[PDB]
Design an enzyme around this catalytic site. Structure first.
Site, PDB file in Angstrom:
ATOM      1  N   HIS A 142      -2.057  26.088 -46.296  1.00 60.92           N
ATOM      2  CA  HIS A 142      -2.181  25.329 -47.542  1.00 60.92           C
ATOM      3  C   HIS A 142      -0.887  24.576 -47.850  1.00 60.92           C
ATOM      4  O   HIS A 142      -0.899  23.380 -48.184  1.00 60.92           O
ATOM      5  CB  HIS A 142      -2.559  26.320 -48.664  1.00 60.92           C
ATOM      6  N   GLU A 143       0.247  25.264 -47.741  1.00 57.70           N
ATOM      7  CA  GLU A 143       1.534  24.649 -48.064  1.00 57.70           C
ATOM      8  C   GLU A 143       1.893  23.549 -47.082  1.00 57.70           C
ATOM      9  O   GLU A 143       2.300  22.460 -47.496  1.00 57.70           O
ATOM     10  CB  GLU A 143       2.645  25.680 -48.148  1.00 57.70           C
ATOM     11  N   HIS A 146       0.066  20.343 -47.726  1.00 55.05           N
ATOM     12  CA  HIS A 146       0.615  19.456 -48.762  1.00 55.05           C
ATOM     13  C   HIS A 146       1.564  18.416 -48.166  1.00 55.05           C
ATOM     14  O   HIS A 146       1.560  17.249 -48.575  1.00 55.05           O
ATOM     15  CB  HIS A 146       1.330  20.250 -49.863  1.00 55.05           C
ATOM     16  N   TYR A 157      -0.392  14.087 -57.701  1.00 56.68           N
ATOM     17  CA  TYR A 157      -0.704  15.491 -58.030  1.00 56.68           C
ATOM     18  C   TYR A 157      -1.102  15.645 -59.500  1.00 56.68           C
ATOM     19  O   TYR A 157      -0.462  16.365 -60.278  1.00 56.68           O
ATOM     20  CB  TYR A 157       0.465  16.388 -57.669  1.00 56.68           C
ATOM     21  N   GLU A 166      -5.354  19.348 -53.785  1.00 49.28           N
ATOM     22  CA  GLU A 166      -5.507  20.793 -53.715  1.00 49.28           C
ATOM     23  C   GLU A 166      -6.618  21.201 -52.756  1.00 49.28           C
ATOM     24  O   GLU A 166      -6.442  22.126 -51.948  1.00 49.28           O
ATOM     25  CB  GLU A 166      -5.763  21.365 -55.113  1.00 49.28           C
ATOM     26  N   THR A 194      -3.348  40.611 -55.250  1.00 49.94           N
ATOM     27  CA  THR A 194      -3.724  41.869 -55.915  1.00 49.94           C
ATOM     28  C   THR A 194      -3.884  43.036 -54.949  1.00 49.94           C
ATOM     29  O   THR A 194      -5.009  43.478 -54.648  1.00 49.94           O
ATOM     30  CB  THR A 194      -4.975  41.697 -56.782  1.00 49.94           C
ATOM     31  N   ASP A 226      -2.240  22.565 -66.033  1.00 52.93           N
ATOM     32  CA  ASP A 226      -2.307  22.573 -64.572  1.00 52.93           C
ATOM     33  C   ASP A 226      -2.412  21.145 -64.008  1.00 52.93           C
ATOM     34  O   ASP A 226      -3.192  20.869 -63.092  1.00 52.93           O
ATOM     35  CB  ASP A 226      -3.466  23.461 -64.110  1.00 52.93           C
ATOM     36  N   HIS A 231      -5.853  22.879 -59.698  1.00 56.66           N
ATOM     37  CA  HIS A 231      -6.266  24.117 -59.044  1.00 56.66           C
ATOM     38  C   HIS A 231      -7.613  24.625 -59.557  1.00 56.66           C
ATOM     39  O   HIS A 231      -8.095  25.677 -59.096  1.00 56.66           O
ATOM     40  CB  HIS A 231      -5.218  25.232 -59.214  1.00 56.66           C
TER      41      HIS A 231
HETATM   42  C1  LIG Z   1      -2.367  29.091 -52.020  1.00 60.52           C
HETATM   43  C2  LIG Z   1      -1.693  29.712 -53.250  1.00 60.52           C
HETATM   44  C3  LIG Z   1      -1.338  31.187 -52.988  1.00 60.52           C
HETATM   45  C4  LIG Z   1      -0.445  28.926 -53.658  1.00 60.52           C
HETATM   46  C5  LIG Z   1      -0.705  27.535 -54.249  1.00 60.52           C
HETATM   47  N1  LIG Z   1       0.571  26.870 -54.554  1.00 60.52           N
HETATM   48  P1  LIG Z   1       0.707  25.240 -54.502  1.00 60.52           P
HETATM   49  O1  LIG Z   1       1.206  24.675 -53.196  1.00 60.52           O
HETATM   50  O2  LIG Z   1      -0.691  24.645 -54.869  1.00 60.52           O
HETATM   51  C6  LIG Z   1       1.874  24.804 -55.815  1.00 60.52           C
HETATM   52  N2  LIG Z   1       2.455  23.465 -55.657  1.00 60.52           N
HETATM   53  C7  LIG Z   1       2.868  22.626 -56.625  1.00 60.52           C
HETATM   54  O3  LIG Z   1       2.870  22.971 -57.774  1.00 60.52           O
HETATM   55  O4  LIG Z   1       3.237  21.444 -56.068  1.00 60.52           O
HETATM   56  C8  LIG Z   1       3.871  20.477 -56.926  1.00 60.52           C
HETATM   57  C9  LIG Z   1       5.340  20.354 -56.594  1.00 60.52           C
HETATM   58  C10 LIG Z   1       5.931  19.148 -56.129  1.00 60.52           C
HETATM   59  C11 LIG Z   1       7.296  19.091 -55.840  1.00 60.52           C
HETATM   60  C12 LIG Z   1       8.099  20.223 -56.015  1.00 60.52           C
HETATM   61  C13 LIG Z   1       7.513  21.423 -56.440  1.00 60.52           C
HETATM   62  C14 LIG Z   1       6.163  21.476 -56.735  1.00 60.52           C
HETATM   63  C15 LIG Z   1      -1.544  27.705 -55.525  1.00 60.52           C
HETATM   64  O5  LIG Z   1      -2.770  27.652 -55.498  1.00 60.52           O
HETATM   65  N3  LIG Z   1      -0.855  27.948 -56.680  1.00 60.52           N
HETATM   66  C16 LIG Z   1      -1.542  28.146 -57.939  1.00 60.52           C
HETATM   67  C17 LIG Z   1      -1.777  29.615 -58.227  1.00 60.52           C
HETATM   68  C18 LIG Z   1      -0.463  30.316 -58.488  1.00 60.52           C
HETATM   69  C19 LIG Z   1      -0.558  31.546 -59.390  1.00 60.52           C
HETATM   70  N4  LIG Z   1       0.768  31.850 -59.926  1.00 60.52           N
HETATM   71 CA   LIG Z   2      -6.684  41.980 -53.831  1.00 61.50          CA
HETATM   72 ZN   LIG Z   3      -1.538  23.600 -53.430  1.00 61.96          ZN
END
Ligand SMILES: CC(C)C[C@H](NP(=O)(O)CNC(=O)OCc1ccccc1)C(=O)NCCCCN
Ligand SMILES: [Ca+2]
Ligand SMILES: [Zn+2]
Ligand SMILES: [Ca+2]
Ligand SMILES: [Ca+2]
Ligand SMILES: [Ca+2]
Length: 316
Positions: A142-143, A146, A157, A166, A194, A226, A231
């Protein structure tokens, strides 16, 4: 660093043993020279300064608890590189073998992971909501996805473009999980989410509503939280992708599944040839139709199934 390529051994977040590509120069570093211009894994040491220090180890054995998130960030970056190269003929995230950098042990109790514009970053979790997030191959992919999106379609975004952004990361995170073929599913983050609750996940692609996310455009979120629900509204596109691959009847609309490989071809072509930074859901539908037409022909089942899947989720 300059050195010679070596092979270390270690244990990941879930306790599994794996070999890792390292580099020897006084220390053994988490630097894999076998893929593009390298995969490099760093220790952020519980702080928020990035990237931190290139991971150094005295003996090329990575069995300490502190090592486990680094082992998995490094190894799963390699798997994701291999997926893009072998399946889509794409060399790293920029298509020109850019070095792939990740930092682990970011912050304290940090329940997230992200691409910061330049590198991947993984928290350790708080031990309750998450364990160290690089333990999930779908999370790592996923990361890195991006970064692929940012270099290609460039989806902003926020709002619908951000929900597509996403969903693209969830889709390819899942396809990488199937590629590696260890307990694959259409759920997101189950391996690190969890630890005290079995059977759950952060999101579901097969049934987004299980976690309160929409599975039809009429249920989309349009508030400001969000980044406009990136998300949350991803569930609508995740559901469409799941239907294209697996088939089903959803709100009375029947979709003939065409399988994961064709899903991935269609969405990879859409991402890299047709989407733009501001594409909305209707424009994604058009991009996926055109992509399937290019790959399989206007009269193909694949085109017909793309249309049925977007109809099923209310996207025209
Ligand atoms: C796959 C999941 C485990 C992780 C996943 N993280 P993500 O990559 O979408 C978060 N990126 C994000 O904000 O980019 C914007 C950005 C741009 C430049 C610099 C920094 C940030 C996600 O669903 N998070 C939401 C749930 C987190 C529950 N506390
Ligand atoms: Ca779990
Ligand atoms: Zn993401
Ligand atoms: Ca060691
Ligand atoms: Ca799984
Ligand atoms: Ca999964």
């Amino acid at each position: 660093i300059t050195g010679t390529s070596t092979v270390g051994v270690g244990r990941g977040v879930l306790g599994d043993q794996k070999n890792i590509n390292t580099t020897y120069s006084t220390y053994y570093y988490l630097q894999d020279n076998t893929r593009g211009n390298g995969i490099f894994t760093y220790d952020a040491k519980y702080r928020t300064t990035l990237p931190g220090s290139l991971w150094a180890d005295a003996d090329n054995q990575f069995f300490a608890s502190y090592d486990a998130p680094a082992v998995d960030a490094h190894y799963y970056a390699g798997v994701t590189y291999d997926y893009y190269k072998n399946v889509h003929n794409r060399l790293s995230y920029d298509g020109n073998n850019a070095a792939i950098r990740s930092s682990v042990h970011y912050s304290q109790g940090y329940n997230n992971a992200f691409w910061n514009g330049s590198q991947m970053v993984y928290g350790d979790g708080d031990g309750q909501t998450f364990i160290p997030l690089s333990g999930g191959i779908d999370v790592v992919a996923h990361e890195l996805t991006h970064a692929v999106t940012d270099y290609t379609a460039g989806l902003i975004y926020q709002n619908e473009s951000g929900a597509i952004n996403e969903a693209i990361s969830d889709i390819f995170g899942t396809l990488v999980e199937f590629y590696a073929n260890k307990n694959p599913d259409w759920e997101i983050g189950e391996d690190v989410y969890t630890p005290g609750i079995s059977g759950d996940s952060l999101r579901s692609m097969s049934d987004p509503a299980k976690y309160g996310d929409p599975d039809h455009y009429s249920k989309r979120y349009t508030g400001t939280q969000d980044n406009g629900g990136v998300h949350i509204n991803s569930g609508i596109i995740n559901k469409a992708a799941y239907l294209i691959s697996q088939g089903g009847t959803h709100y009375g609309v029947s979709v003939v599944g065409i399988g994961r490989d064709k899903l991935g071809k269609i969405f990879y072509r859409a991402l890299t040839q047709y989407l733009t930074p501001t594409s909305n859901f209707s424009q994604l539908r058009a991009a996926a139709v055109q992509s399937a037409t290019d790959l399989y022909g206007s009269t193909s089942q694949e085109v017909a199934s793309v249309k049925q899947a977007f109809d099923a989720v209310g996207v025209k």
